[PDB]
Amino acid sequence: SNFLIPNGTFFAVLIIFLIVLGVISKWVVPPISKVLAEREAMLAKTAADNRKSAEQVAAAQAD
């Protein structure tokens, strides 16, 4: 009756929720951010490699 009245679960969920938070902050967000940074660095390296290959071809032609 009158379910709007809170109860002990008011804490339990939080407790459980807390654990979940930590897990995601320990082995999901950090590694996924590292993967995203790795991919962005790979793309930057690819573009720089293309530009430097063009420049190196031009230079070798110049020498």
Binding site: S1, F3, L4, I5, P6, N7, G8, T9, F10, F11, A12, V13, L14, I16, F17, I19, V20, L21, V23, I24, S25, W27, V28, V29, P31, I32, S33, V35, L36, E38, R39, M42
Partner: protein, 238 residues
């Protein structure tokens, strides 16, 4: 014979009453999310093609990152993203699992379920909202000192309307909690209602409602996320 409420697995402990049904639901959801977390940890890879779980997790991270960066730069608030991702994924999984077939004859002209969506209890949403409230108020205090934060929030963007300002800060958590309850509690009602119809006619309305409830849970996860990110951003600026 509608049986709204009547939480099962109710148990006392150290002078505090607990609804064990929501405990079981939240525990199962946490187990599922934990399983996904380790499964990603086992195949987080950049050299090869990503697996499905990695794709889902990076989609979630992309959404959260874009939203935060759009509102307030990550450089100021690096801890928004984990909390927002946890909130979104946890709520979405919890509500999605409700679509499973857990309605059985109640021997009473009613319907009962082993797994009810955890949001059906106000305690869950109240806990989540209070958690976010304390989190971002602490963040604001850490941002602009103990004296500044109350001054800033009370004065608001306009000082001519000091009273109403207070209200929104009290509203902010409420807006987060109660609405969520609704969009899930409604579901918990409708299925029960659909129980009255005979099977041979009950199968269709139940199915359509379950599909729409999947969609509703998804949208609720999304709105809860964006709202918590934007609340953080609102209270983490000078």
């Amino acid at each position: 014979a509608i049986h709204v409420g009547h939480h099962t697995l109710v148990f006392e402990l150290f002078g505090m009453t607990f609804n064990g049904d929501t405990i079981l639901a939240t525990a199962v959801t946490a187990v599922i999310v934990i399983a996904l977390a380790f499964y990603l940890r086992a195949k987080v890879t950049s050299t090869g093609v990503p697996s499905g779980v990695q794709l889902f997790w990076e989609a979630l991270t992309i959404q959260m990152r874009q939203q935060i960066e759009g509102s307030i730069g990550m450089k100021i608030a690096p801890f928004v993203l984990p909390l927002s991702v946890t909130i979104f994924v946890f709520i979405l999984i919890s509500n999605w699992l409700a679509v499973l077939p857990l309605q059985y004859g109640g021997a009473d002209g009613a319907a009962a379920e082993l797994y009810k969506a955890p949001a059906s209890d106000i305690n869950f949403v109240l806990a989540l909202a209070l958690f976010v409230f304390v989190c971002y108020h602490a963040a604001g205090i850490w941002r602009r000192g103990i004296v500044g934060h109350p001054i800033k929030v009370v004065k608001g963007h306009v000082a001519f309307l000091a009273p109403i300002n207070i209200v929104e800060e009290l509203a902010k958590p409420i807006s987060l909690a109660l609405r969520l309850f609704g969009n899930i509690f409604a579901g918990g009602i409708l299925v029960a209602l659909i129980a009255m119809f005979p099977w041979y006619i009950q199968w269709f309305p139940n199915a359509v409602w379950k599909t729409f409830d999947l969609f509703v849970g998804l949208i609720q996860a999304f709105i809860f996320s964006l709202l918590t990110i934007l609340y953080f951003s609102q209270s983490m600026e000078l």
